[PDB]
Amino acid sequence: NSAIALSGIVSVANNADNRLEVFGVSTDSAVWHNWQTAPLPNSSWAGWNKFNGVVTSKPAVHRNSDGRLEVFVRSTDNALWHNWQTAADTNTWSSWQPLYGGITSNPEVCLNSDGRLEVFARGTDNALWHIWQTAAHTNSWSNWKSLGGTLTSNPAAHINADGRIEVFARGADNALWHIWQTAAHTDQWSNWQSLKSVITSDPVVIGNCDGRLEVFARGADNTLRHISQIGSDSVSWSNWQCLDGVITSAPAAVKNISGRLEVFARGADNTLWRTWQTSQNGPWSNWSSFTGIIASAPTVAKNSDGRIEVFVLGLDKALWHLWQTTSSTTSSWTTWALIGGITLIDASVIK
Amino acid sequence: NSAIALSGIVSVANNADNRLEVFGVSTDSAVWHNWQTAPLPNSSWAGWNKFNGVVTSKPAVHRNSDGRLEVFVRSTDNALWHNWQTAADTNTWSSWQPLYGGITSNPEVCLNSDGRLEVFARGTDNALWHIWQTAAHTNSWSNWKSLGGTLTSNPAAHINADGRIEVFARGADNALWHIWQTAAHTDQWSNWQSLKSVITSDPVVIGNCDGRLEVFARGADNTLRHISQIGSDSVSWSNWQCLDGVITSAPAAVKNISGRLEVFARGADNTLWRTWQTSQNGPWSNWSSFTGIIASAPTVAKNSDGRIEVFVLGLDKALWHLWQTTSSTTSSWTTWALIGGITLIDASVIK
Amino acid sequence: NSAIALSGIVSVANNADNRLEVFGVSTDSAVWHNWQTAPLPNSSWAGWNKFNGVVTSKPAVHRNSDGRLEVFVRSTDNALWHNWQTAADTNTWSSWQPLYGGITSNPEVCLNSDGRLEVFARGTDNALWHIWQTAAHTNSWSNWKSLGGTLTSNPAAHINADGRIEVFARGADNALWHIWQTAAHTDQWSNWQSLKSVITSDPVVIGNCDGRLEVFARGADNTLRHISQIGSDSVSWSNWQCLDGVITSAPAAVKNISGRLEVFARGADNTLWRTWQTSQNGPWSNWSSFTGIIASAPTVAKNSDGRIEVFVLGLDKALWHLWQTTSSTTSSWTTWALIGGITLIDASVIK
Amino acid sequence: NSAIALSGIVSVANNADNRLEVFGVSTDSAVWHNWQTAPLPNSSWAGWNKFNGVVTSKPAVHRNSDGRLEVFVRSTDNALWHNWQTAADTNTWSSWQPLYGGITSNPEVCLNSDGRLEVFARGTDNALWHIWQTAAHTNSWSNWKSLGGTLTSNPAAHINADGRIEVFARGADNALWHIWQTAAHTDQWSNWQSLKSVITSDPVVIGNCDGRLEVFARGADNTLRHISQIGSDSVSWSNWQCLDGVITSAPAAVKNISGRLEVFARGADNTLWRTWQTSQNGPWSNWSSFTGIIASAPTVAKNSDGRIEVFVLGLDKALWHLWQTTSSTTSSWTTWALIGGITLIDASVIK
Ligand SMILES: CO[C@@H]1O[C@@H](C)[C@@H](O)[C@@H](O)[C@@H]1O
Ligand SMILES: CO[C@@H]1O[C@@H](C)[C@@H](O)[C@@H](O)[C@@H]1O
Ligand SMILES: CO[C@@H]1O[C@@H](C)[C@@H](O)[C@@H](O)[C@@H]1O
Ligand SMILES: CO[C@@H]1O[C@@H](C)[C@@H](O)[C@@H](O)[C@@H]1O
Ligand SMILES: CO[C@@H]1O[C@@H](C)[C@@H](O)[C@@H](O)[C@@H]1O
Ligand SMILES: CO[C@@H]1O[C@@H](C)[C@@H](O)[C@@H](O)[C@@H]1O
Ligand SMILES: CO[C@@H]1O[C@@H](C)[C@@H](O)[C@@H](O)[C@@H]1O
Ligand SMILES: CO[C@@H]1O[C@@H](C)[C@@H](O)[C@@H](O)[C@@H]1O
């Protein structure tokens, strides 16, 4: 059906020096951010810092090709705004600047392989729209342009190994649909094509170490399902497979430094669950639980030494995190620790 | 729930010279058999030949370690009987000889790695029972002995790569359960352990080319699901995965000569469907259909040159087959051809 | 150059019940054999038993498709003779029967996938010759027939996964050459083709679990080298790779029950060395040594529970063996133990 | 022995927008550079542009974590100097700035995973020395510090998947030696350890998509050899393997967008040769030749759409290039095309 599983409560990015930095919306409806002081999971965090301005979406973040983080959000009148570091690895930001338009989803940002950011969002006519940097890592943007379709989830964009951006979204029939650049980093796009099934979360996309994209989503029966490219184009995919175990949030996927995939999701008992590929391309482990009730989907990242780190909303409405203790992929994990200073709200547009 | 998907209509074996031979039950309630005259899929078949005697199960067949085929069936009073070739690759059979007992499933036969046949069946108390050759390829059998449990499907047995027989069956809770030799070819067995889930077919088991067993079955939502060993013991398995596509028979699995798995099943439109692993351990292709409505599950085998061949019941109640045209695993396939002479009935005990 | 590294001192086969049985030539110039009483590496051995008759080659053995072992040897006048078990798993043998011809290598036997044994040997004109069973597992043989070429090593034959026999031998230029059935189990053969390089041992061939043959041999610099099929035909192969470490015998290859390859050879210090694939298709481990000076190449086999076992000639001129302690492929190993009763000689024709 | 195979004639880097840029030494002994105008292999090139100043090494280049290219070279008095783009993707450079020291190899630069450049070179005492940025992408450098050893080749540095820099060099015994950070991006280093063998080129290092480093080098018999990590630490490696085919330059390695490795080297006939992995981890293809005699080792890079591109010195002493025609990894290749404007010299210090 048409449910959208609970989103992650923050977006995360690595800075130019790989320090992790998180962005979320507080009770004042402003975006706040916090960062590691050094790029290791046991680092202190700087503390929560506000960007002035009321917002009405989850903030999206990406690192420019010159190392500067840039954040995208929706304003009260549904326009898109963006902020950026004015130099890499520095806490001096531009404050919010306008890209106009009217959007009806969270904004989603991807980096073209020619160094230009590109933003995707659902529009007021429910089509997919996009806007892009016209020169790499420069505040020079295109006009808005439509890619059509009818969307019923937030979009997810990811670059193929050959540099073609590909965008995924739920359609009017609740199936997963996708559309792609047919030449890398150009405004030449395919038609929409359906990958069928029914999904009940936003899609989540990752690249494998054989150059094939893989998509994860919750399905109609509330279990995790996934599908992958089988060749070196966007057209031909595997069948869908679902894994046993009811999940109650969007999934978050990560490729560990051994090249194998891991997926995290809130489980049926409202704790964080993890599953991983036990061999090349499969199969998948039984889900393993971490202690503690959580109140959002996980958001996952990797530190400068490869260690996986996970962020979640706690029952105190604050952000908590845990991580791998060693770069070994069968390393033990820490238990939830607080990143205190503010509490957060779920501003995701499509919920 | 407690449905058991339609079974295959014949069992099949390779003779000592790899000629295929099929066994099924005709309208007279007798077992009839037919064989290739030469071990190639385009060979003529000898014609259907009767074993005298009324039976009340699907016949099971296995090749002894001396090359002689041996068939196991249930009689009207629920006892087990067996017949054998008196020399490899010859049509001179022993006629039915008694192993007594009382069984309430189809008999299932496996070959120990010390060359002794072993037969498994559900008993009159719904437990798993077994009986075995006490010397390899010899008509000298043990007494019947119980392995306990409560079974609600026919059993499926397969040997691990380390020589330990492992038996799979649906239990009273409709989950997949299993039990195993703890030392190869000995009467030292584990306790029953559940692999969970719910299955609505008999389980079907195959060995991968990394030494790991994999089990296929139809699930509660009538799609194919599968699970595999993740290590080099019987205890630790993957999570279950289900593949999209409703199936309407038991599946049949085969390892092609490139070492990759293929599964065949009757689909939702009552045609034969096939899916295959597109890479090592996964993922799986979309199902592909063959033309023609079929009236049983497929039974699958491989010829002396590796070519896959599939048998099914047609709407005329006769046996049909098709095969790969070349030893290439992306070879085209023939269309259904008749193996005429008799018509067949489904004598499977648990249906 | 034209050296041929020291051969194994026995051939070995698994009986129908998987008991290991070894064949070698004693100081009386007769073939003697010995066998496990039960199919486990720690089993007692029956004791050494003689086949009457003087021989002038290493004996070759293969199991027929009806489970009966059959041995091939050369007589004083260079004719081929064979002996067989008259029933599987029994010590009642036919005594030596004539196949005539004149051969100038050790005989090499392979089993076609239609159940017919086929023997290859160098002839008096240095070409490759062959002779075969005309019906599976029957004492009915063809006439001798030439496959041409010029051979400078003993031949090695192995069946492809699609049932085509392929034969390998060193040629007049000291390179590895090969020739193959172009249809499985038929007398339709390719032309000779060179795989180039230079080898200084007989070639040793094994099948991988993706259906590709791989060939091992000592090279000109006395290190192990190997080459593999890259597709699903006999024509297209990889480049050669050599592994560091000087070896002083023929290698012996085995596929462990995890599907990975291991190679054993006498090393530069005259001890047994082993190397194994640390991942799928590679790379290879550093050689690991077993304690004890040895006086032949290893001969390797697998027991009914998958455990690898190795046989060698000791400095006392008797046969010794060691094995894996568990079915785990990183299991510890036993130390050399004697299979006493006779001493052995190297009767290999081409040395 | 102590030969060092011919080096590449340029270094290459991707700009922040992925445009390729090459650096080499002309007949005036100055560094000149040239770049793609757009990041595609069929792009025009801007033309050759000079950095004023006489140099006495091959120039090394790396992209900072803020996207700015930075070049390292030796001056007449053997000191290290560096130049950088003052903004990403712009042709406004700092001109040469001093890092002093005295070096006796080409400088080699690597990027730590905390965004700090680090430079390695042989010193006047033949030990390995290093110097580093003390803050990411900032002109603030450490003092020089020794890592000891005795070097007889230029060093090669590469980051492990867990963020630890590892450095490779030939030692006084002509073997490959290595040393590594024991904590990522810290000045805590291991002792030197030997990987044995004998190499007759500089080592060339790449990371696989399972997180394992692999090293290529020419060996004593002038063939390509390679060795790889087998676990997730720096300590345990495979045996060495050599591939047939005599090579007459350093090799250049690249990971294609399907995750498989390819190696290029000048061959025995003075043409460019290529070999590639035909499966996961192996084996390797026979070498394939491109038409045309070449006068240096290849330098290899990848374009924004994944396409591989190769640079070489021609017999006219100018730079030529060729590339893949499509993002397919079995795509055809172009033939050599000139990047004209200057001629080049081999300034590599250790030759
Ligand atoms: C620029 O156009 C405005 O913004 C787009 C993103 C769409 O919502 C469109 O319907 C709207 O008119
Ligand atoms: C082009 O197709 C349109 O857009 C897709 C994204 C889907 O919503 C589909 O149902 C709709 O008709
Ligand atoms: C030998 O025992 C008989 O046969 C077994 C297979 C069981 O059905 C048992 O209950 C029955 O009494
Ligand atoms: C040992 O457990 C028993 O047998 C199994 C095969 C299952 O039927 C289970 O429900 C039952 O209690
Ligand atoms: C049957 O022919 C005889 O045996 C063959 C195996 C060859 O040695 C041939 O030269 C010889 O004449
Ligand atoms: C067909 O070629 C012949 O036989 C091969 C086996 C090689 O000995 C070769 O040198 C010889 O000319
Ligand atoms: C800073 O030290 C100088 O430069 C180093 C790189 C070494 O060559 C050293 O011997 C020399 O004295
Ligand atoms: C620490 O060891 C020293 O440095 C290495 C790099 C080698 O040159 C070795 O021969 C030398 O003794």
Q: Give the neighbours of chain D: at least 3 Cβ pairs within 8 Å.
A: A, C
Q: Which atom of ligand 6 is nearest to the CA of C149?
A: 4
- In whole angstroms, give the CA distance from residue A80 to residue A274: 34
Interface test with C, best of B43, B162, B328 (most C CBs within 10 A): B162
Element at C72 (helix H, strand E): strand C69-74
d(CA C307, CA B213): 18
List, as one string, the DSSP characters of B216-269.
Answer: EEEBTTSEEEEEEB-SSSSS-BPPPEEEEEEB-S--EEEE-TTS-EEEEEEBTT
Count how many residues are written for chain C: 351
Q: Which two tokens stand for residue B263?
A: 């599964």
Sheet holding D252-255, edge to edge: D252-255, D261-266, D271-276, D288-293
Of all residues in chain D, the one with the smallest CA distance to C274 is D239
Give the pocket of ligand 6 (CB within 6 Å): C 149-150, 171-173, 177, 192
B350 DSSP 8-state letter: -
* Within-domain flag for D293: yes
Nearest to A154 by CA among A135, A169, A139: A169
Partner residue facing C283 (CB), from D243, D245, D282: D282
Distant-in-sequence, close-in-space partners of D242: CB < 8 Å, separation ≥ 6: C241, C242, D219, D221, D223, D224, D225
Could you tell me which residues come within 8 angstroms of residue B76 by beta carbon, excluding any fewer than 6 positions away?
B54, B56
Q: After which residues is chain C broken (C to N over 2.5 A)?
A: none
- Max distance between CA atoms of chain A, in angstroms, equals 49
Method: X-ray
Q: How far is CA C110 from the centre of its chain?
A: 10
Element (H, E) at B157: strand B156-159
Answer whether residue A57 is part of any domain. Answer: yes
> From its phi and psi, is residue C325 left (phi > 0), alpha (psi between -120 and 50) or beta?
alpha
- What resolution in angstrom units was achieved for this structure? 1.6
For residues B172 and D50, what is the distance between their CA atoms, to the nearest angstrom?
82
What does D175-221 look like in DSSP terms, one character per residue?
-EEEEEBSSTTSS-B---EEEES-BSS--EEEE-TTS-EEEEEEBTT
Q: Residue B147: which domain range?
A: 11-345
Question: Helix (H) and strand (E) counts for chain B?
Answer: 0, 29
Tokens of D77: 């008095």
Structure tokens at C75: 């007589």
Strand order in the sheet with A165-170: A156-159, A165-170, A176-180, A193-196
Contact C30, C52 (CB under 8 A): yes
SS3 content of chain D, % helix, strand, coil (to 5): 0, 50, 50
D236: domain CATH number is 2.120.10.70
Is residue A185 a known part of a binding site? yes
Residue D37, classified by CB atoms within 10 Å of its CB into exposed (0-12), middle (13-18) or buried (19+), is exposed
Q: Quote the ligand 5 centre to C29 CA distance (angstroms).
A: 24
Check pocket membership of C123 for ligand 5, CB cut-off 6 A. yes
Q: Calculate how far, in angstroms, residue B188's C-alpha sits from the geometric centre of ligand 4.
A: 19
Whole-number Å distance, alpha carbon C104 to ligand 5 midpoint, is 10
Q: Is D78 in the pocket of ligand 8 (CB under 6 A)?
A: no
Among B67, B161, B328, the residue with its CB nearest the CB of C306 is: B161
State the ligand closest to the CA atom of B145: 3
Contact partners, residue A183, CB within 8 Å, separation at least 6 = A164, D305
The C-alpha atoms of residue B178 and residue B191 are separated, in whole angstroms, by 9
CA of D184: which chain A residue's CA is closest? Answer: A305
Determine the Cα–Cα distance for residues C109 and C112; give it in Å rounded to an integer: 10
Tokens 């290493």 appear where?
C58
| Distance from the first to the final alpha carbon of chain C | 13
A233 is in an annotated binding site: no
Is residue A1 situated within a structural domain? Answer: no
Ligand 6 centroid distance, CA of D225 (Å): 30
* Chain C residues closer than 8 Å to D245 by CB: 239
Backbone angles phi, psi at B315, to 5 degrees: -70, -15
Query: Considering only CB atoms, which chain A residues are within 8 Å of D259?
Result: 208-211
Measured distance CA(B155)–CA(B205) in Å, rounded:
11
- 3-class SS of residue A247: strand
First-residue to last-residue Cα distance in chain B? 13
A9 to each of A30, A42, A344, C41, how far by Cα in Å?
A: 14, 21, 7, 60
Q: Which ligand is nearest to the CA of B169?
A: 4
In a domain, C350, yes or no: no
Q: Nearest residue of D to residue A159 by CA position?
A: D305
How many distinct structural domains can be found in chain A? 1
Residue C2 maps to a domain = no
Q: D109 and D119 in contact (C-beta within 8 Å)?
A: yes
| Contact yes or no for D24/D7 (Cβ under 8 A) | no
What tokens does D227 get? 């060795």
Phi and psi at A190, nearest 5°, equal -75, 180
Question: Does residue A154 form part of some domain?
Answer: yes
Beta strand A69-74 with A60-63 is antiparallel
Q: Is the CB of B306 under 6 A from ligand 3?
A: no
Note the ligand closest to the C-alpha atom of C119: 5
Q: After which residues is chain A broken (C to N over 2.5 A)?
A: none
Of D239, D332, D317, D315, which Cα lies nearest the Cα of D27?
D317
The answer to whether the annotation marks B233 as part of a ligand binding site is no
**Test the A interface: residue of B199, B237, B240 with most A CBs within 10 Å:** B240
CA pair distance D336, D333, nearest whole angstrom: 9
Q: Does residue D5 belong to any structural domain of this protein?
A: no
